[PDB]
Amino acid sequence: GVVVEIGKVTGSVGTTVEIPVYFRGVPSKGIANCDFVFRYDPNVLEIIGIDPGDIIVDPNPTKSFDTAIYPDRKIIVFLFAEDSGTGAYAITKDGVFAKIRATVKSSAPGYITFDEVGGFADNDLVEQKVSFIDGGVNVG
Amino acid sequence: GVVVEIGKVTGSVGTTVEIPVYFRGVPSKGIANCDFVFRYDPNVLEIIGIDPGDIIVDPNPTKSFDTAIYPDRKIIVFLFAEDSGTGAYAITKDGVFAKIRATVKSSAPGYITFDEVGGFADNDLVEQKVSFIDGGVNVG
Amino acid sequence: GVVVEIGKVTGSVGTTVEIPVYFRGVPSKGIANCDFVFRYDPNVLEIIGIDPGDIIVDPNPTKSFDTAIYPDRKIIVFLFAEDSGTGAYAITKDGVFAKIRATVKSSAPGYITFDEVGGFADNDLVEQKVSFIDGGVNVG
Amino acid sequence: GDVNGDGTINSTDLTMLKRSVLRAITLTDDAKARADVDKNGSINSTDVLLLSRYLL
Amino acid sequence: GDVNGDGTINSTDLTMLKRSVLRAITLTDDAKARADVDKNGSINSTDVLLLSRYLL
Amino acid sequence: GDVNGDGTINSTDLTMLKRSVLRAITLTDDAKARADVDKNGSINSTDVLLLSRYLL
Ligand SMILES: [Ca+2]
Ligand SMILES: [Ca+2]
Ligand SMILES: [Ca+2]
Ligand SMILES: [Ca+2]
Ligand SMILES: [Ca+2]
Ligand SMILES: [Ca+2]
Ligand SMILES: [Cl-]
Ligand SMILES: [Cl-]
Ligand SMILES: [Cl-]
Prior knowledge:
The complex is a heterohexamer, with three copies of chain A and three copies of chain D.
Chain A: E1 2-6, E2 8-9, E3 16-24, E4 33-39, E5 45-52, H1 61-64, E6 65-70, E7 75-81, E8 95-104, E9 110-121, E10 130-133, E11 135-137
Parallel strand pairs in A: 1-10, 2-11
Antiparallel strand pairs in A: 1-3, 3-8, 4-7, 4-9, 5-8, 6-7, 9-11
Chain D: H1 11-21, H2 29-35, H3 45-55
Helix pairs in contact in D: 1-3
Protein name (chains D, E, F): Endo-1,4-beta-xylanase Y
Domain Dockerin (chains D, E, F): 1-56
Family (chains D, E, F): Belongs to the glycosyl hydrolase 10 (cellulase F) family.
């Protein structure tokens, strides 16, 4: 089915790095909506923002794509639901779904791991099979 | 005055059980509104829902009765306020106020205990004397 | 620049005391808006309310002044933004900005310390330099 | 009755009050005073009943 | 669709639903049932899509 | 100014912004950018003042 890949990057303490979230194996009907939660360590990584990738084609991306960061709860949340009304702004190709901007606070491994998945449906509102690969910063 | 009884039930691990909340000694003027908080252990019991009992007579029970479950805060909250506008949907007889649906996660005692009470008034908006008996699952 | 002084008071266990928050060195253009967070120990002090001081001149003080108390998060928050629309309700003189009402729960030092500051601007919307002095109850 | 303090008493106030009693949200110190309909120092189901009756 | 249960389905419901999925807020047990647009026992992005399309 | 992003700037936006600064609620990442009225990278009382003046 669909494979969601949390990227693996390296960076120095005090620098801000970008951790890509990849969508692999996007079906022919596409992906009209999805939501999922990732876990992280706020003592290791300070996540300052999340941006939509190029596979989100909505000219007003905030209408279809939104996120939230909770350091006290040690989680980040993604919400995608294409806002065309017709299925026009659905994800149809593989690539970067989102980019996590994080400032490295310590040399320890900064794991960004899959926690929970909600909906993940195509344009026919059929829920797709999905699997997650964990990643993060300095985890190799 | 009024006695609120948290029921005591037994059940196997992996099964979903129902824990009744009883209202005893309901006054002649009835009970137009009430709110209270119960404490529980989320590691022992997974509370998946709370339903109104038969002593709530509102044909649209959600208008008069609402609840909330907070596993991270280890509490459940009850809010009753009869929605007729005249006192018609007030509780007038003894019996089951609410049913707590919980899935047993472990063999340890699953205490559901009284934490806090707010309002508890009759149809004349007079606050009634109220006492609580603790219960739960596998607590005997 | 501007100095914010958390007052230092003494009181017996079981009594409610008032901890003044002073604004010192108020500029000539005044203070049109400010927000900041203070830290405290809920086991030592039970903060039951925060009132605006006499340096807030808004005849409807709640329109310009608001606060919040979070015992579970061990913080209190202040929000001032003069509501005249012209700069008329800005703070123009030194004195008591706010009064923290707290009931002393234990004999231990009850520190009320500066945690975070947001905006702190004059009537020309210029952000002012500001410093904080920590205080509390029975901290001497 | 005017929980949020926007100048109008409507369904939005009751929703905020009910969610507050159910502990879903916290109210600010100013809002707490306005949510205390019967002014007895507590925000509970009695306030909920009174506000809902006022709107109905 | 009527998340808050005020009798009208509008933008306020979608905002509450989206914030719930993003875990910014919690919904009450009554609201949870009404937020479950497709009635599959979960409140997620599929409900968000359906409600947003209904309003549009 | 449009905190919730419903297309209209009204009292609901100011209430959300004020509650955010008072730390009663959290805003989503999209809402955070729109709540940043003066676009200085922080959401505070200066944004509150500017939005309240805009509505008045
Ligand atoms: Ca109002
Ligand atoms: Ca009250
Ligand atoms: Ca509604
Ligand atoms: Ca659903
Ligand atoms: Ca708006
Ligand atoms: Ca700003
Ligand atoms: Cl709310
Ligand atoms: Cl909301
Ligand atoms: Cl809000």
